[PDB]
Amino acid sequence: GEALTWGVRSSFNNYSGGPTEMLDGAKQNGTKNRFTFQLESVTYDEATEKLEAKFKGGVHYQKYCADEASHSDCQLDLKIENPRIVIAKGGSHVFAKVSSKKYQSSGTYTNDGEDDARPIAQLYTANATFKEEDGKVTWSEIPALLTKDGAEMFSNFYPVNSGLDSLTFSFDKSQL
Ligand code: HEM
């Protein structure tokens, strides 16, 4: 409860062997493919029908390290932190603070996670499960697709609109 559960992308966790480290209190399951980010805050504006939930914690993936024992000088170095979900009438998305080294380049893809023009995923709540009981709200198995920014974070290894892991989050009605 009071958390976001999301694995980002199943095949990416398999390719990378999962995050080299969990950041800022985020947790991971035993198989390193499902992450849990604690709820920082949640607001719902009735008139605009906009729900916004901010979570804490991050994942750091590293691969192709020149010093493999200490994970230093890694050609693949991806951080995804403080996920924020916006579920609204005009569109639903996942935003996050990202830093990702680009494939065959010195360029680093960055995203501060506070720019509404640069979401990393688009969310489709039409067929997701929604439950509210005993003051607890859970919105489960919400499908997610990669946006243009999300594709850039993965060095365009995936096309735009390719699938991501579905997400689940929960909060108490008292926190609204
Ligand atoms: C610079 C050296 C790199 C080499 C030699 C390399 C090699 C490969 C190979 C052989 C695959 C195919 C296996 C698979 O799809 O699981 C792959 C997949 C992938 N690579 Fe890397 N890669 C490099 C860097 C990067 C970087 C910098 C990124 C950026 C995030 C990246 C992201 C990906 C992604 C997203 C996939 C798809 C994995 C999946 O979902 O299965 N790669 N890479």
Author numbering: 115 to 290
What does the study report here?
The ChtACR-hemin complex crystallized in the C2221 space group, and its structure was determined at 1.63 Å resolution using molecular replacement methods. Two copies of the complex are present in the asymmetric unit (ASU) and are well-defined by continuous electron density. ChtACR is composed of 11 β-strands that form a sandwich constructed from a long antiparallel β-sheet composed of the β2 and β5- β9a strands, and a shorter antiparallel β-sheet composed of strands β1, β4, β10, and β11. Hemin is nestled within a groove located near the end of the β-sandwich, partially ensconced between helices α1 and α2. The side chain of Tyr129 within the α1 helix axially coordinates hemin’s iron atom and forms π-π stacking interactions with its A and D-pyrrole rings. This face of the hemin is also contacted by a “helper” tyrosine residue (Tyr178 within the β6-β7 loop), which is positioned to form hydrogen bonding interactions with the metal-coordinating Tyr129 residue. The structure of the β6–β7 loop housing the helper Tyr178 in the ChtACR is also distinct, as it is considerably longer than the corresponding loops in other CR domain structures, and it contains a unique disulfide bond between Cys179 and Cys188. In particular, the phenyl ring of Phe271 (α2-β11 loop) is stacked over hemin’s C and D pyrrole groups limiting their solvent exposure. The Phe271 capping residue forms a T-like interaction with Tyr217 that may stabilize its interactions with hemin, as the side chains of these aromatic residues are arranged with a plane angle of ∼60° and a centroid-centroid distance of ∼5.2 Å (41, 42).
